[PDB]
Amino acid sequence: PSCTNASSSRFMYAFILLVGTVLGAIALSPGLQDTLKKMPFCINSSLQVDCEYALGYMAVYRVCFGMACFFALMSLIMLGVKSSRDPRSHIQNNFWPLKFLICFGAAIGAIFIPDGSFGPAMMWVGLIGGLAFILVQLVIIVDFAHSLAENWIESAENSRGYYYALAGVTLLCYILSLTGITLLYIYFTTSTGCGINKFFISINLIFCLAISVISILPAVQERLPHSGLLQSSLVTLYTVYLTWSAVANNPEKECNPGMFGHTTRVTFDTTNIIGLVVWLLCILYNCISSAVETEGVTYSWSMFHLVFVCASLYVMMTLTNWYKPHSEIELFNGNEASMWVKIVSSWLGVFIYGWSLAAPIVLTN
Amino acid sequence: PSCTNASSSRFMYAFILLVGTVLGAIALSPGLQDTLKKMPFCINSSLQVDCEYALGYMAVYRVCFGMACFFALMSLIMLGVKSSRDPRSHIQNNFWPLKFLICFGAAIGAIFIPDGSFGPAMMWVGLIGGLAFILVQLVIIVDFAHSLAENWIESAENSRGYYYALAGVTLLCYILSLTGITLLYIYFTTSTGCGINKFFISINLIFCLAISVISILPAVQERLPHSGLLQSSLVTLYTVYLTWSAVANNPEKECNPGMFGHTTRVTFDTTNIIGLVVWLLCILYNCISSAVETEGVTYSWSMFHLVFVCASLYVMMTLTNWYKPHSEIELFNGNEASMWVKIVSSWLGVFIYGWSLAAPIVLTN
Amino acid sequence: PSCTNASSSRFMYAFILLVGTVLGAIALSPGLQDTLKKMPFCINSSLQVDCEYALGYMAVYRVCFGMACFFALMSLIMLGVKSSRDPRSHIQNNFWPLKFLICFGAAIGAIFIPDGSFGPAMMWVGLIGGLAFILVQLVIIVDFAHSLAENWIESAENSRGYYYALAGVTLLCYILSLTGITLLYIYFTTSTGCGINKFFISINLIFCLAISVISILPAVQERLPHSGLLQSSLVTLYTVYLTWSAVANNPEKECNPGMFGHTTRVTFDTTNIIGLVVWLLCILYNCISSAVETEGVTYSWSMFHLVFVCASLYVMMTLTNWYKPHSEIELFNGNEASMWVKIVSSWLGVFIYGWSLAAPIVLTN
Ligand SMILES: CCCCCCCCCCC(CCCCCCCCCC)(CO[C@H]1O[C@@H](CO)[C@H](O[C@@H]2O[C@@H](CO)[C@H](O)[C@@H](O)[C@@H]2O)[C@@H](O)[C@@H]1O)CO[C@H]1O[C@@H](CO)[C@H](O[C@@H]2O[C@@H](CO)[C@H](O)[C@@H](O)[C@@H]2O)[C@@H](O)[C@H]1O
Ligand SMILES: CCCCCCCCCCC(CCCCCCCCCC)(CO[C@H]1O[C@@H](CO)[C@H](O[C@@H]2O[C@@H](CO)[C@H](O)[C@@H](O)[C@@H]2O)[C@@H](O)[C@@H]1O)CO[C@H]1O[C@@H](CO)[C@H](O[C@@H]2O[C@@H](CO)[C@H](O)[C@@H](O)[C@@H]2O)[C@@H](O)[C@H]1O
Numbered sequence A, B, C: 001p002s003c004t005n006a007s008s009s010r011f012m013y014a015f016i017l018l019v020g021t022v023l024g025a026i027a028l029s030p031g032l033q034d035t036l037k038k039m040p041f042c043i044n045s046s047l048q049v050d051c052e053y054a055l056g057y058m059a060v061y062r063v064c065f066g067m068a069c070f071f072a073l074m075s076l077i078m079l080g081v082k083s084s085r086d087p088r089s090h091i092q093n094n095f096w097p098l099k100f101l102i103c104f105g106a107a108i109g110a111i112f113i114p115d116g117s118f119g120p121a122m123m124w125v126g127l128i129g130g131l132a133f134i135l136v137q138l139v140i141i142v143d144f145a146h147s148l149a150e151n152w153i154e155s156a157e158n159s160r161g162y163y164y165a166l167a168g169v170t171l172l173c174y175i176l177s178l179t180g181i182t183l184l185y186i187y188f189t190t191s192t193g194c195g196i197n198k199f200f201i202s203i204n205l206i207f208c209l210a211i212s213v214i215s216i217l218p219a220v221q222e223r224l225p226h227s228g229l230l231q232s233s234l235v236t237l238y239t240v241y242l243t244w245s246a247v248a249n250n251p252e253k254e255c256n257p258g259m260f261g262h263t264t265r266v267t268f269d270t271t272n273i274i275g276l277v278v279w280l281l282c283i284l285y286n287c288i289s290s291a292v293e294t295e296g297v298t299y300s301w302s303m304f305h306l307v308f309v310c311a312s313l314y315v316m317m318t319l320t321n322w323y324k325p326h327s328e329i330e331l332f333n334g335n336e337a338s339m340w341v342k343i344v345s346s347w348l349g350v351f352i353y354g355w356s357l358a359a360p361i362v363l364t365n
Helices: A002-025 A047-053 A054-075 A098-110 A119-156 A162-186 A196-214 A232-246 A270-287 A301-319 A337-357 A359-364 B002-025 B047-053 B055-077 B096-110 B119-156 B163-187 B196-214 B230-247 B272-288 B301-319 B337-357 B359-364 C002-025 C047-053 C055-078 C096-109 C118-158 C165-189 C196-214 C230-247 C270-287 C301-319 C337-357 C359-364
Strands: none
Touching: A002 A098, A002 A270, A047 A054, A054 A098, A054 A119, A054 A301, A098 B002, A119 A162, A119 A232, A119 A270, A119 A301, A119 A337, A162 A196, A162 A232, A196 A232, A196 A270, A196 A337, A232 A270, A270 A301, A301 B196, A301 C118, A337 A359, B002 B055, B002 B096, B002 B272, B002 B301, B047 B055, B055 B096, B055 B119, B055 B301, B096 C002, B119 B163, B119 B230, B119 B272, B119 B301, B119 B337, B119 C301, B163 B196, B163 B230, B196 B230, B196 B272, B196 B337, B230 B337, B272 B301, B301 C230, B301 C270, C002 C055, C002 C096, C002 C270, C002 C301, C047 C055, C055 C096, C055 C118, C055 C301, C118 C165, C118 C230, C118 C270, C118 C301, C118 C337, C165 C196, C165 C230, C196 C230, C196 C337, C230 C270, C230 C337, C270 C301, C337 C359
16 A cells, blocks of 8 residues: 555656666767757857867756756655655655656756856765765665675575575675786886875775675674675675776876877766666665665655765766866866765775674774 | 645645746746747837847746736635635646646746836836745744754753754854855945945844844743744844845945946846745745644635745746846846845844744833 | 536636637737738738738637637537436536637637628627626626625624725725726816717716715615625726726727827727726636526526626627727727717616615615
């Protein structure tokens, strides 16, 4: 009755966000839209280089602003709700076409916003939202790892069917992370040119070893028996991903060969694909009867919409490769304020996991 | 059954007003529509300067007139209702697409109204509606402040979690208001040129201090214990906002540097954004099971629609920056009849709050 | 169940008539449609002056003919009904989109009717319908005045809240009527040129004084205590309105300064706006559970549709300012057959009220 319709609503909102992202990403195609994008919002006209070179980025900004506003509004409405008997529960579950048309309407109206001062404000808002959503998806990954490891250990160790896979998953994740760290050492640093990259990569490797060291010692396993190695494995893979994605945006042509060492600067590579896939997996696991974010409500109706606002901003930032608006083309898709945010996010996430796993042991002895 | 559908209707009307405002504001874009707006309603042709320079303003007038008429009509229908069993309750809750199409139909029909005598009449109607809605939203803000302060004081003071925030909110609002009053002193007045601004700002500061002085004395707190400082803080912030918005329209180029000291005169700044945000918050708090505006009806079905008529007129005025139609471009977006209305509204609002807070104390001793 | 759906139907028919009137009045715009109106129905071509000068008038005729036919047909169907159990009750309440599409379909089909002999026949039909609907709305106004005066006197005189308003309404209506009669004396007559206007205005003033004299004497109040002054006040205001609207169409350039003393002759002034507002108020008060026009039916299903036919014809006539088709432009929007109909309607209405108020007193003594 009520619960199944509420969960169907939780999935309908995910479908809304998905349709919005797919519609936003149809832009920035190499030649199929970069000439069509000249009509919609540059009729108003360091501004000229941005209107002339990167059109898909502006289109993505104007599209995702609409979804951010829609989900912020839905968060403001569903504020203070206590039980499923409130009259506002009736508007969250029934009227779907109105919601679709409002969301898209907002996108179409926002596309008319001219350029000149809209860029940088949204860059800062996107940085904040990206930090928030990175931390949220780290929490989701940790919860999923706990659940999976516990389930396989409890249900499978009576047999030999899943134990092999239980070892193989963590072995494959470790070898992927190690090959990735070696590829970083090989490519994204020189002999004596860039030291900051040799600092970032090395300190992330140190944290990724200390985390798996602390995750196994028996004093922690005494409280919960399933400390295992899978959790630390998935976490270290994710942290290596963030290390690579953060070093990718180094605004120094001395060493960085990614972009620095052409009629456009909009690019789409394997990095963005991996990012979107991890994003989608986290969003779907958030909606499957989970709160890893009659009387009583399972999930707070406002925190859910706030999480979707953060997710929409994260998509805004990751589809545009975290660039700085109104910058000359020689700088070419790299800013300095994004790498620090990403790497501080990675460090805070490693701290969160290492603390939540071994807080009382350190508090006592 | 009945109540949940009635509240869903109260929110559907807010969605109607929101869609109308968003559609009205897509106009007045700097170059994306100012050339398209030449066909619709100037084919008829101090009138020529208005048709040639400010097209977005006329489009906004013609759009918002339709919503004003629609909500006035809905107010006239739902007149005299007593209980939820009347046959007219069936038409207020069910037929939504007809209502959407009637409202938009009215907008599309009104866009055909030619120029020449339509402007000034609507300017006066908009002034009256703006006065009414400013006072309404002041009442809503005062009620919200009472509710929030009472809730936090009663539920939180047993702990230390919210007391810090209870002090921080009022501290932040006070520092914002003080920095704003200082910025007004710095910018919107000269040494010896404009004295009327040094009068308005100073007298508003005097009222904003006396209000917080009276809000704290123990004789008033004897009746209600939660007199506090949050109410006076939010009220003084709102009054400083109105002081700034009223001084912005001074029709004197001697001192005012806002607009006085270009192919168009339609502008959109941070002032309009703050105005629209406060507007939206007040409209949403009006609809959340509140009447701060089986047998018996919670809210009078006609007063609600009258409040929405006033709200639509207020949007009409604030999206067009309160200008005077059919005025030469040198005057440039400033009239004299708006500043007096805004400031008299501010003074009457301060009087309303100061009276409602300390009426019986003054009546007795 | 049945009653609420029947009343919703009574309001849906009013919405149909409103949408039809709004669509008909979008025409006759000064330049926005007078060039577009050259294609639709003059491809067929004292006829040429009407096709060349007044296009909005013909468009309004062709539009309102469709609604007249639709409501006449609905009147013919719902003939002889006795109870709410007849099978024809099922078609009056359910199938709305079909009705909308039939009505508009009829309008679109009627727009194809060519010119040459369609004008004058519809002028005479419109005169008859206008007489009928003027008398109907007079009856509605009298009933409303009785209801309002009785309600305020019975519920309010225990207090002092509404007595002031009960006097103020009648005072304001009297002063409006007197200023109007003086403005007529000043403007619409000369010193010795037009005597027929000095006859009409003076005799209407005499009737409007005698009516208020008879409405107060105690012999009439003996039967019903609420004879009062409000009824006579609203009635005399309405009669002064009809006097002004009838004198406006005097086909004499000697005195009349309204139109007599330009590429078109279609005009739209404050007269038409007041007319449409009074029309809308009467139509809405007709539908609010009233018959001022299980077993048993409250309102006769055929008389309602006949009243709407008369209303549609009245709108047809008042949107076109009661002009004579196929007349030379020098005559310019004034005919002689309309003023007599309007003024005879006014006199018959004053007679109806004066009789219904004081019939038995005169019959006995
Ligand atoms: C829920 C809310 C729904 C809101 C809907 C709003 C719809 C707004 C439509 C906006 C839009 C299409 C783009 C839409 C993008 C949508 C993206 C959707 C994405 C997801 C799917 C309309 O395109 C217009 O194009 C015009 C081309 O002539 C037509 O003009 C016809 O002839 C006219 C002769 O005067 C008549 O006047 C008009 O009547 C006619 O028609 C217009 O009819 C037409 O509307 C904008 O197109 C633009 O095209 C350019 C010429 O390429 C226009 O001209 C430029 O303007 C100067 C300004 O400074 C420039 O400096 C200059 O270069 C140039 O002069 C622009 O002005 C603008 O119009
Ligand atoms: C629920 C109610 C629904 C009611 C719907 C009503 C729809 C009314 C449409 C109105 C409108 C579009 C704008 C609509 C704006 C909508 C805004 C919506 C906003 C939210 C989304 C129709 O545009 C017309 O444009 C014409 C252009 O030629 C076409 O003419 C075609 O060829 C013809 C050859 O003779 C045929 O005769 C016709 O048959 C053909 O088709 C018309 O077919 C077309 O309809 C008005 O456009 C205007 O365009 C201009 C030329 O730019 C027209 O010419 C001007 O008029 C003089 C007058 O004095 C001017 O002095 C002069 O400069 C010029 O001569 C205008 O007259 C007017 O037409």
